[PDB]
Amino acid sequence: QTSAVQQKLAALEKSSGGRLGVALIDTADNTQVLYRGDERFPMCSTSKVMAAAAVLKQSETQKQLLNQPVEIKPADLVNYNPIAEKHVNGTMTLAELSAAALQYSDNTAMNKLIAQLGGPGGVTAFARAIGDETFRLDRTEPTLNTAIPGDPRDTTTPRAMAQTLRQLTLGHALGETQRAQLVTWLKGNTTGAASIRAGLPTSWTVGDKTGSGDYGTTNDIAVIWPQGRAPLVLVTYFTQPQQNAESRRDVLASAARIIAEGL
Ligand SMILES: O=C(O)C[C@@H]1CC[C@H](NC(=O)Cc2cccs2)[B-](O)(O)O1
Ligand SMILES: O=C(O)C[C@@H]1CC[C@H](NC(=O)Cc2cccs2)B(O)O1
Ligand SMILES: [K+]
Incomplete structure (x- = not known):
């Protein structure tokens, strides 16, 4: 079937000229809303969540x-x-690198997390260990953001990423203090106010990780604590046909607004 929410997301996508992927999990009832939920998208800097979580593990x-x-x-x-x-010619701790990668989207910090895990495949191995058979990290920064249409490298699906983000932040993929640390980091993100956050009621609390890449790739993955109801997990991925396309954080905000209006 096609729901009213899915039809609105398709209209947004059509107007945008690009390709939009959405996955919601509402933990009030464990139901899901998906739009292109099983298509692959380049993760870009949203992959920093998996790397930081693997180090937390x-x-x-x-x-x-x-x-x-x-x-x-x-x-x-x-x-x-x-x-x-x-910190050039100095050091950063693994906590400092995790915080920098997550809250400031620092690419050198991400590369140090990847190296601590033995390379991109160590991030993929962690994903597999926590039940995600879809995620793959294949390259380091900056080339993991090339975002070429049809390229499987450094991709996941909205469905898989929403499920994994739920297990990491609200479930038990991590130990209790590590889950709390990940949530604290995401809630302190500096880069998110134009993306999913911008489409939601101002009273709700969000923790998120954005990403930007070539092909105008504009992504956000979020845990959301709405006023008056159980948490949500929302993934919004967007990519465009031209390599030099501009960022479109407003499209993510629009997708989140449609999702919120459908609850
Ligand atoms: O063009 C130029 O004159 C050089 C630029 C300067 C900085 C650029 N780097 C960034 O802007 C970082 C990003 C943040 C968010 C999305 S990209 B670059 O290193 O790509 O080259
Ligand atoms: O979190 C954000 O929204 C910003 C953050 C910037 C760093 C990463 N992007 C890039 O390095 C851009 C690149 C494009 C092609 C090669 S490198 B990431 O995906 O996103
Ligand atoms: K690993």
Whole structure:
């Protein structure tokens, strides 16, 4: 079937000229709303959640892991490093790298998380360990954001990412203190106010991770605590036909507004 919400998302997509993917889980009843929910999209910086979570999982058996210093060298800087560049020729702890990757979208920080996990495949292995058979990370920063149409590298589906984000933040994929740390980090994101957040009532609380890539790829994955009801998990992925397309965070806000109006 096609619901009223799905028809509105299709109209938004048609007007946008791009390709939109949405997955909602409403934990009030465990129901789902999907739009292109099983199509693949390039994750771009939303992949930073999986990398940080994989390090949190490692930290469950190493009380000092998050305090471990990691050297930052001039050669480690890439294309977007606002936190890591302040620590060149110094160090950042794994907690600092996680916070920088999640809350500031720092790409050097992400590369250090990936390296701590043994490369992109270590992030994929963690996804598999927590029940996600869809996610794949294949490259480091910055090339994981090329977002080429039809390329399977560094992709997932909306359905898979919503399920995984639920298990990480509201379920038991992580230990209790690690889940709480991930939620704290997401709630302190600096980059999200134009994306899913912008389509929701102002009284609701959001923790999210955005991403930007080539092909105008504009993404957001969020946990949402609405006023008066159980939490939601919402993924909104958007990608466009031209490599140089502009970001369209407003489309994500519009998708979130349609979802919220359908509850
Ligand atoms: O064109 C130029 O004169 C050089 C630019 C300068 C900085 C650029 N980097 C970014 O803007 C980081 C991003 C943040 C969010 C989306 S991209 B670049 O390193 O790509 O090259
Ligand atoms: O969180 C955000 O919205 C911003 C954040 C910026 C860093 C990452 N993007 C890039 O490095 C851009 C690239 C495009 C092609 C190659 S690199 B990420 O996907 O998004
Ligand atoms: K792993």
